[PDB]
Amino acid sequence: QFLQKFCAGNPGNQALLHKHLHLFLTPGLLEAETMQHIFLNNYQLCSEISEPVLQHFVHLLATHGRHVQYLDFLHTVIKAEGKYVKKCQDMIMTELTNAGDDVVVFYNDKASLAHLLDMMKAARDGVEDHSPLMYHISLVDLLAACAEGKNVYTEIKCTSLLPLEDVVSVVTHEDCITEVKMAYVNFVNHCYVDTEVEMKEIYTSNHIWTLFENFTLDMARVCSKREKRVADPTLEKYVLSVVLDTINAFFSSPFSENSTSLQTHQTIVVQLLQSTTRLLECPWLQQQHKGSVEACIRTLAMVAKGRAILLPMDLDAHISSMLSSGASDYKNIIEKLQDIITALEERLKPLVQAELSVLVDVLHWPELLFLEGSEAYQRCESGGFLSKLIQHTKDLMESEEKLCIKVLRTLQQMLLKKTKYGDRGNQLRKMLLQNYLQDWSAIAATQCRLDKEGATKLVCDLITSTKNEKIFQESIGLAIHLLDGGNTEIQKSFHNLMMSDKKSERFFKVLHDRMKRAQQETKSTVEMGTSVLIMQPILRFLQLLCENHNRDLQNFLRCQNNKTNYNLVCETLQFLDIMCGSTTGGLGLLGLYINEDNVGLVIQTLETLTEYCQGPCHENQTCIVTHESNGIDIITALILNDISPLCKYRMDLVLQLKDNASKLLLALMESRHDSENAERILISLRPQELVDVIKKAYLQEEERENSEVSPREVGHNIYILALQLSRHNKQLQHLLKPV
């Protein structure tokens, strides 16, 4: 009990207790209660929860017995800080389905229904704190929460477990408790009215109307109890919260337009409308509940107007009038300390940068600290401290993730240009350096020295074998810094390692797996998911590898000599196609897929593709041109179809996109004399449109005022593309001839 109170409302204690989580991973009701409290109102822990915790809880429920503490823990896990966790819902549903019928029990048979009624009347006064009745209620709520997420299979399974007829039969019985009624209504709302299944049985069926008249009866009893001072809080919450939501969901859906066609349904709709009209009259309702009631009334009223329903004059006038009306000193010390803390932090912030920058400078030349002529000085002069740092970084990967990350970040700062921290920072840096120690060319020398140490091997080793995203990202960043400026020595070192090392297959596989996940996330977008952000560094690293016209590296990116080859070249093309929408994007709807956020990534993909082709390498050009994804059409559509939605507020991005696309197309056939490349592009392109866009670019001088890339320059590049194409198409040659 002390532990539960300690980690009550403060995530800091919850994380602190989670540090020793393995203590509580044992059978026991008290342990389960503590586990529930720890993961209560904590999105970070709920999202970070791993498979073993959920699997262990499911196992205990299946084997230990039928208990609610497990269900309680699962329910808090799914919902945290008002936002559902999709991964937790899917995992829980899968485990429940795989566990069997022991964990999931539903009373649907005639004997089971009689058994439900027998317990239901027994617990008429109230629900016991430990009984199978509330176990079923918790299970129903748990399934409803799982079905809330967007997963078609989960909703189908939930619908199968509890059919519509069963809900109607259980609820309609006079001997029914409010707790089960609210749970079943919530389950129906989360599964039937709101569902991705195309069956939509609820919207077209007579079963729901039974619930509607039961809801009308429940509201009638509630208001009568209010008049008689026999108000029951449970019933009030029932009608106010879930009944209103269920009514709103059905009658506000677009599939309910044809649902109400018969007279019986019309009368029932009238009964509901008048019932809520009576409810709003009473003053006991609160503002929070009034809004929900008003929303239901408004939804019902508009449905009435659309269907031209006939209502009694007395209540019809009242409803219309209501609708019109709605439309028309310890504190001093504590605060003082806070200001001092903020002031000190701001004042001392610049010096921290200088102090950290001393670390990299020390790592640059550790020799100075040791006395001249000693063994340590000789070892430090030729590698030594740095050499051991690279070698032992690989060993410590599993031992300490944070230490490796810090080492990589320090190494990246080593390979980065120095910056002026400030007057105070400069003075501190100078003082520290004197106490301790007594340019593109410089960057190139530093990169070569680190490569000699084994940085390239370390980066390859980190990338191929790593289960931590941060370490992989840091390794990619270090590689980009090492290759920055198109250094040939680093590029050759990567080539030698890839050929000699037998683990290059894993490197290509992980990149391939990472690439596909980005495409799937990009496809699912129809803000940015984690996969796409990590997409850009991989492309940048590949581009730097192919920098300075490296033919062999470009060939290895396309295909290698190993057993199973992954062609990284077309993955960028496929990703671009899906990002822009693929075929539909290039059919005139290009502007509906490119937003301000993703322009930069698209530019990087196009630039990377251009560097692949600008060998001049024929294999890459044919591979991209002849690829089955039809990425040429979208690439051409970029030049032809201007991105109007983006041009309204940002034209420079559009021009840069146009410029990069033109460069890529030029590289696609820059050094090709065969017409196959020209034929495919011409098929995707339209000669009449090409001359038109060229004319518009010539006349697009209006926006040249605030254009980093002149529209004239891209227009000329397109013309050169057209001229190169005229050699194989007679029609394009004819139009391109000026009068």
Binding site: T159, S160, E198, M199, T583, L587
Partner: protein, 599 residues
């Protein structure tokens, strides 16, 4: 042994809870059922044409799907249409290019039904009709993205990347659904003994049985299962089998038409079966091979039997219900000099010889139905000698005709069952609902208009389909429709009490029947005469709201002979009497139309 190839025609045999081939219900039904009692590997089902699936490569549907959603502004729709057509063309060329490639484990394939030309697909959103837990599996014409099916090993011997071998047990995992196909144990209420196929986690294994290879699928050679008709060049008559006196008899039908080749008949359609050691295997036919001929309309097998009276015909051709006996084996003898014993060319003259008896089939000028006016049935015999003046041309058949025959045969069988059930005395609500569904389907079939929700009773035909009308008459379905009219009024249902809402469902069924009769006859004399032969029953039922009067007026409006012969003073008395009882202007219009025929 051989490796599975793209384009091969194979049959999938589910091994697990239910052991049987996968087939599809006839008519328009898109459900797939596994029938354990139909047959096994040793004894394939009699109707093996439903169990054949062709393997096709992946076909992208992103452009097609975007079109369909947008349909379900004008310039945008046209642009989407152009892309979908381009996508369809890109798919078509890809299949041709990929044709002949080996199928490897872990690859995606599409299964296409030969009889229905529909892809087998899985819809994740919609659950199965019977088992709510599982997903829905159905046949789709165009095929959505669910058509893709990963072919995965079921044995630990095979591994990913290994070529698929014929006879290997494999698991078909849909790309999107992610749950392997499963032959459910839930018996279908509509058809007894038929199970259901749905996508759900299971241990079911599908065995790949080869029926025909891609190389042998050439359209220029005779192949097992082809629907062809045998034409007698000498007598210029088509081989046919029909019921004459309660027994089915084979003969040559005499045709009064100027062009004999144009006398196509639904009962003259035969199916060629190539007999091999493996019953499941089919393949192309060779000159030296053995063949079997099956009647599609009935399913009997052509054979020979002792002549009761012996004449020059020692053995007379007859149809036997079962073809497993050696008496149904036949050999093809070329008329011209062919190159060795290679594939039999399509549309080539051949002579049929009886292996068991070693005799050559001959045509005789002795009618079977001598005791009738203008006999049209000619007996076919066999003699030990060879007659070089006689052969049987193998005339091909269009795909439309075979599809129509299957529809007509299935509709006739159910209607016969419905007639028997009505004749018994009691019919359940479900059975009559199915009958009504079948009747409206037949009404659409005869009319041929697309089904878009328009009322079946109120429908017009700009150009009647002669082929379907002839099939309607020949398959005895019109006789079944007449039986449905006769048995109830004999009582299960009374005409005078039809107005009651209790009998409302029957009224609709009778209305549908007359619509079939009305749509069956249009600008065709033979159908009009056949229907008018039962004028007594229709005349007796006039007056009740069953649309009987409309059918009578339409039938007699364009036929002077029937109008003069049938309409005597009695019918005029009935019409005027009904006018007096109803005082309805409609009856006046019917009389006015009756007065003047053909303007």
């Amino acid at each position: 042994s051989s490796f599975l190839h793209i384009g091969d025609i194979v049959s999938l045999y589910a091994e697990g809870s239910v052991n049987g081939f996968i087939s599809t219900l006839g008519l328009v039904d898109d459900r797939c059922v596994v029938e354990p009692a139909a047959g096994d590997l040793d004894n394939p089902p009699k109707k093996f044409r439903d169990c054949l699936f062709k393997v096709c490569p992946m076909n992208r549907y992103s452009a097609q799907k975007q079109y369909w959603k947008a349909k379900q502004d004008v310039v945008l729709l046209q642009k989407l249409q152009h892309a979908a057509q381009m996508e369809q063309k890109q798919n078509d060329t890809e299949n041709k290019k990929v044709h002949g490639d080996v199928v490897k484990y872990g690859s995606v394939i599409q299964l296409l039904h030969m009889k229905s030309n529909k892809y087998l697909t899985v819809n994740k959103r919609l659950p199965a009709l019977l088992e709510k837990n599982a997903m829905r599996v159905t046949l789709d014409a165009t095929g959505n993205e669910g058509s893709w099916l990963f072919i995965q090993p079921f044995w630990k011997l095979r591994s990913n990347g290994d070529n698929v071998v014929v006879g290997d047990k494999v698991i078909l995992n849909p790309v999107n659904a992610g749950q392997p196909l499963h032959a459910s144990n839930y018996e279908l209420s509509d058809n007894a003994g038929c199970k259901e196929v749905n996508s759900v986690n299971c241990n079911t294994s599908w065995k790949i049985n080869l029926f025909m290879q891609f190389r042998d699928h050439l359209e220029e050679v005779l192949k097992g299962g082809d629907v062809v008709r045998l034409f007698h060049a000498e007598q210029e008559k088509f081989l046919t089998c029909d019921e004459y006196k309660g027994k089915l008899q084979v003969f040559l039908r005499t045709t009064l038409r100027q062009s004999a080749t144009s006398a196509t008949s639904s009962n003259a359609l035969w199916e060629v079966e190539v007999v091999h050691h493996d019953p499941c295997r089919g393949g192309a036919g060779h000159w030296n091979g053995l063949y079997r001929f099956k009647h599609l309309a009935t399913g009997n097998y052509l054979a020979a039997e002792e002549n009761p009276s012996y004449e020059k015909i020692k053995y007379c051709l007859v149809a036997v219900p079962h073809g497993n006996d050696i008496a149904s084996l036949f050999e093809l003898d070329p008329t011209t000099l062919q190159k060795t014993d290679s594939f039999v060319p399509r549309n080539s003259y051949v002579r049929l010889r009886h292996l068991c008896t070693n005799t050559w089939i001959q045509s005789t000028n002795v009618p079977i139905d001598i005791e009738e006016e203008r006999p049209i049935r000619l007996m076919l015999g066999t003699c030990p000698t060879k007659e070089d003046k006689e052969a049987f041309a193998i005339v091909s058949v269009p795909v439309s005709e075979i599809r129509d025959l299957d529809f007509a045969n299935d509709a006739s069988s159910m209607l016969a069952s419905a007639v028997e059930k009505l004749n018994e005395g009691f019919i359940s609500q479900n059975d009559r609902r199915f009958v009504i569904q079948l009747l409206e389907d037949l009404v659409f079939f005869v009319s041929d208009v697309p089904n878009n929700g328009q009322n079946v009773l109120d429908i017009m035909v700009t150009k009647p389909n002669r082929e379907r009308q002839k099939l309607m008459r020949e398959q005895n379905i019109l006789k079944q429709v007449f039986g449905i009219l006769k048995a109830p009024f004999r009582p299960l249902v009374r005409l005078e009490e039809l107005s009651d809402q209790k009998n409302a469902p029957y009224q609709h069924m009778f209305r549908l029947c007359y619509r079939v009769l009305r749509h069956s006859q249009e600008d065709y004399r033979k159908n009009q005469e056949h229907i008018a032969k039962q004028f007594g029953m229709m005349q007796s039922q006039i007056g009740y709201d069953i649309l009987a009067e409309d059918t009578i007026t339409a039938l007699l409006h364009n036929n002077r002979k029937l109008l003069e012969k049938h309409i005597t003073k009695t019918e005029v008395e009935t019409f005027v009497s009904l006018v007096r009882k109803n005082r309805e202007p409609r009856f006046l219009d019917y009389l006015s139309d009756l007065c003047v025929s053909n303007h």
